[PDB]
């Protein structure tokens, strides 16, 4: 019992110190930031 | 109200409202993060 609860208290420490712990997710709203960006950014585009 | 505006040479339709936006002497209409119009001044008198 305290193995556990002293180790949910490192996640809780982990979690709130690491600014890229959640990194996998980060990468949804980034890639879709980056789609959209671009997605916008080429109208903007002559093509010629 | 929603309107089609010609302002500053912009052409486009859109909703007029106004906005605490600080506009530099010199700087006449503003770009959101897509170089799109988010907010203009007025080309005749002075008004944001």
């Known amino acids: ?48 | 109200k929603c309107v089609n505006f010609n302002f500053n040479g912009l052409t486009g339709t859109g909703v007029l409202t106004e906005s605490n936006k600080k506009f530099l002497p010199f700087q006449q209409f503003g770009r959101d993060i897509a170089d799109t119009t988010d907010a203009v001044r007025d080309p005749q008198t002075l008004e944001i």
């Not at chain 1, 809780?12 to 990468?27: H, I, N, P, V």
């Not at chain 1, 930031?33 to 950014?41: C, D, F, G, H, R």
Request: proline letters at 0%.
């Open chain 1, 1 to 48: 019992a305290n193995q556990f609860n002293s180790a949910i208290g490192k996640i809780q420490d982990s979690l709130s110190s690491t600014a890229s712990a959640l990194g996998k997710l980060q990468d949804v709203v980034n890639q879709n930031a980056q789609a959209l960006n671009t997605l916008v950014k080429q109208l903007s585009s002559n093509f010629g």
